[PDB]
Amino acid sequence: PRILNSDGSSNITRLGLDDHYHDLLTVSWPVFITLITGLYLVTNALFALAYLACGDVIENARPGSFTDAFFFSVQTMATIGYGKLIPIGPLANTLVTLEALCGMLGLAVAASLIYARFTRPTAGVLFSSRMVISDFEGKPTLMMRLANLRIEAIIEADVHLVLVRSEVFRRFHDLTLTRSRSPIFSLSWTVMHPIDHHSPIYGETDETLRNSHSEFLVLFTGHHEAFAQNVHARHAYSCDEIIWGGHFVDVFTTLPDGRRALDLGKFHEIAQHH
Amino acid sequence: PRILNSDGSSNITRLGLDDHYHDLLTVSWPVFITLITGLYLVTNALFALAYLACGDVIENARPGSFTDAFFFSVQTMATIGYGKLIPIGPLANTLVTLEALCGMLGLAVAASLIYARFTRPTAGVLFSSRMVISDFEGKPTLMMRLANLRIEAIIEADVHLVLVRSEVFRRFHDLTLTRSRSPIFSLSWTVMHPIDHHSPIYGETDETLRNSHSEFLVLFTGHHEAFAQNVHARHAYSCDEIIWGGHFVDVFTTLPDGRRALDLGKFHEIAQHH
Amino acid sequence: PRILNSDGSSNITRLGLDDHYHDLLTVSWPVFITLITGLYLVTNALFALAYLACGDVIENARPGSFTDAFFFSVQTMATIGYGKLIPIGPLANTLVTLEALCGMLGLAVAASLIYARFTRPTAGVLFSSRMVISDFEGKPTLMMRLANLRIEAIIEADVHLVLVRSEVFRRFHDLTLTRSRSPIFSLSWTVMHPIDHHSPIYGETDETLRNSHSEFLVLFTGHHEAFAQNVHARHAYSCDEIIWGGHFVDVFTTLPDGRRALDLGKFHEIAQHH
Amino acid sequence: PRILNSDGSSNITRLGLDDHYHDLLTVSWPVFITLITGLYLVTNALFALAYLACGDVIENARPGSFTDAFFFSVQTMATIGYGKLIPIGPLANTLVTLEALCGMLGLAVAASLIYARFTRPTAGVLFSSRMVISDFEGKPTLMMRLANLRIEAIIEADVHLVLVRSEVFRRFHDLTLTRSRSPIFSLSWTVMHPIDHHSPIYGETDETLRNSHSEFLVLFTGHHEAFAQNVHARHAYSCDEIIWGGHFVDVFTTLPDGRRALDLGKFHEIAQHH
Numbered sequence A, B, C, D: 001p002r003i004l005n006s007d008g009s010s011n012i013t014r015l016g017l018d019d020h021y022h023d024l025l026t027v028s029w030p031v032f033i034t035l036i037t038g039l040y041l042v043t044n045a046l047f048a049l050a051y052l053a054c055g056d057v058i059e060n061a062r063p064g065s066f067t068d069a070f071f072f073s074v075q076t077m078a079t080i081g082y083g084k085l086i087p088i089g090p091l092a093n094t095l096v097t098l099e100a101l102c103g104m105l106g107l108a109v110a111a112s113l114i115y116a117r118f119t120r121p122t123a124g125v126l127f128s129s130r131m132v133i134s135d136f137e138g139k140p141t142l143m144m145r146l147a148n149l150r151i152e153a154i155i156e157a158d159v160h161l162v163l164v165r166s167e168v169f170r171r172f173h174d175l176t177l178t179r180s181r182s183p184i185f186s187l188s189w190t191v192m193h194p195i196d197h198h199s200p201i202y203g204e205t206d207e208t209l210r211n212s213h214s215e216f217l218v219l220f221t222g223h224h225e226a227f228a229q230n231v232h233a234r235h236a237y238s239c240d241e242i243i244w245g246g247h248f249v250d251v252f253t254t255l256p257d258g259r260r261a262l263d264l265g266k267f268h269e270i271a272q273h274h
């Protein structure tokens, strides 16, 4: 009955065109391509209907046939203009310059959206599968760790541990970290909340966390070098993914070569006295 | 006589091409489309005038008729180039490559503006219709609440309560909140200023707020997930939209299903002992 | 001999293609348009030379004449393609698809720069012409003021007063303000540094400021609503633009109408007991 | 055996299509242009295959020859449309409007990437070649300096000194600076960590730094005026590029002219009593 999925998402049901811009960036690429295509056809229909609205003014076109007009409208709106289907007199030539204004316009738009919904990057940060409470520097510290999956660095990265106990009727406690901030994050970061007299989970234990039905949330944010742009990430845990007394395994091996390396294979390994 | 509308706007009359870029992003889409269209026509007129400036150099064109030239200029600037109206000799062919440089250029521009004035997103945050001062955790706290209307989260969101009392001759007091910051805001947030000995509105009452003719302003800001981009929102209240002793109604229902839900229907409901 | 102009610029002479991107955004629009145009011509020359590099493969072209080729190259790179000058066999048709890849490419680029060097907005903030040191709330406060010239608001705006005394050999002191931050700035802001025992200019006087040959710098920054984008501004003063004992004149008139107004006409007015 | 190169890069070996967007921005321009070109050809092959998939419907084309189709597909997808190779009946004309949707689309994309991987600017900040520990204002201060190579200013710039001692097993200490922040950085900045009882390198000496095999990292960040966009920079030192007792040489000459100047020639000069 977790309020929060591992992926940081919420499990609350919400209850309730008017937000086009947002929606446009939001729909599955399948759907997006669809809509664009539809608007593409519809306008050409309109235009080709406007060419018929006057006496057929386009040359090399069958009489009253929309098939021809629609296709002239397309060749005309997309600036191919072979030269078979061609305008006639003032009326056609005007609808043409007007259609073209629209073509050029529609591109600007279509492109603007493409770019808007293209350049939203992911942090590419990995979260540890589990959380561990154990002694660090003489205090039962609760910690979790994250790693940068890419070569390029995230800079001025900051992370937030956040308890969500139940109590009445829901507490949102921002947990104090030994280090909330890292002016740069390129390999691995083990974030830790020392449990002390001000910690909410102070004196707390497993049975008491389950009783509060407490869950923990991680908010990562930073500015990715690769994108010269800001990025974020979430992840959530529950009392049943906290290894008590566990210690994370060292991810830095020294190679036979002698050169130091990072081994993301040990990233989820956790040591425990049994 | 409120200085501030509910929507956060100001009621002060201000007294006073030189700011083109701003203006361009600012005018109603109707007007914007207009201007672009105008510049579109005018240049073609210029160009078509430049084609006439030399002996008619374009083929299949009536003599001295601008109608033909203007339309050749359009087919030429928009790169349709059917092949009926076609250049001749050095002069025409040059104006052509020059016109085309301009077409391609004008698109880049037109598009750049489109995109600039397209990708300014709204926060899609709802503000509570009323403000309520009542006891919270043993102190007369003044509070108001806001909700995220979309699925996607706003992150590192922060809100500001701000008093605007009259006194001489106008005070701008930033009110201290129990929580100015939320590393994430996806459902509902009830912002609260505990009234204590440092509160400006400390000891204050309704009649005294009206006497100061005090108003309150809310500034919301955050970084929207949906847009990977920053967003803001304003809202303002007055002494006559503060329910004294009111309590906001809980917006989280637990469904018969057993799953928890958010009910924005109760968002404006406020309980009051009578 | 001011180190700093009113406009915040520096008067230090600096002593010393390798920075293309920056340069490209930096050069006068005249120059920018030029460069683009040049690259436009040069490539077409190259391409038209590549069409001649094979036997004339383009139809309706004079033999060996580059004039024809260059113009075919343009009609071809800009996708007009009338249909007079047309390709022949494998070679021409290939250079064509290759040229077109380049056309489409060059646009993307040209546009990208246009947009990059277009969407750098100005804050549109006015700085007061003079600075005044005088009593505010029982302390000789040094202050200056700025105003938002546009309707749209700047949000989370912050300002910095900064002394630049000479002493050996140059001090950079960030002056403490009564209010460094304004969660919103839509009309007028009077920024003030109370002179107290920690103020650098504490006990200081005019003759002593001139002796230190001290100057003051203002850094404004905020996030403009109009552009959904960040903006900045600078301005600098000198000891000979500080009215001692001066008071800024109130910029808010109440209209005969009864409605309150902002009068930027009084913005530079400063009252003084004589 | 430095963990960190002068350029701020790491020397850790990492151990391990699924990240297309990132990759696309990441690959050498040579490679990028390649991929785009490939996708350009492949689709045309597909389309030209779709034109053959029906009876040759394009006019002026040899039977079953893909050469013709592929080239018609290109003239058609890139909107040149000479008018030699032209469609026929419903089928061809449809694939045409469909191809064109794709052309226009592919541009939007190609461009979006171009722009994304174009507008990632460099700070253009120079780092001093060496670091020096020596007395400043009565305390052994460790300092290094950086300079703005361009005319345009970086604003709200901040720098971080960061020790990386070995100890078990690696310490990441953020060193306290006399000035971590500069609301503007246009010429030269000498950043300094006073060594006091809280300094990690307090009481430390050269032999002891080498023994800890300590290295130092500099993180620069700010918002460049030239780009109206955020920028960063890194640089790293080692115990063998710290001149003990060294003093940086003054970079500001006063010209014979009388005007003050900045001389980046002395930027790396360091004075030392011998």
Ligand SMILES: C[N+](C)(C)CCOP(=O)(O)O
Pocket: A179, A182, A184, A185, A186, A187, A188, A189, A190, D172
């Ligand atoms: C040391 N750290 C855990 C603060 C953050 C990361 O530093 P790094 O190992 O990625 O360079």
Ligand SMILES: C[N+](C)(C)CCOP(=O)(O)O
Pocket: A172, B179, B182, B184, B185, B186, B187, B188, B189, B190
């Ligand atoms: C708890 N809160 C009021 C601080 C902010 C919102 O948290 P959430 O309910 O949107 O996840």
Ligand SMILES: C[N+](C)(C)CCOP(=O)(O)O
Pocket: B172, C179, C182, C184, C185, C186, C187, C188, C189, C190
């Ligand atoms: C009051 N202020 C001086 C802090 C800033 C501006 O407020 P406003 O008059 O622009 O709304």
Ligand SMILES: C[N+](C)(C)CCOP(=O)(O)O
Pocket: C172, D179, D182, D184, D185, D186, D187, D188, D189, D190
């Ligand atoms: C003085 N400083 C070292 C803080 C930063 C730079 O100021 P400036 O010399 O670039 O104007």
Ligand SMILES: [K+]
Pocket: A078, A079, A080, B078, B079, B080, C078, C079, C080, D078, D079, D080
């Ligand atoms: K075209």
Ligand SMILES: [K+]
Pocket: A079, A080, A081, B079, B080, B081, C079, C080, C081, D079, D080, D081
């Ligand atoms: K064309």
Ligand SMILES: [K+]
Pocket: A080, A081, A082, A083, B080, B081, B082, B083, C080, C081, C082, C083, D080, D081, D082, D083
């Ligand atoms: K044609």
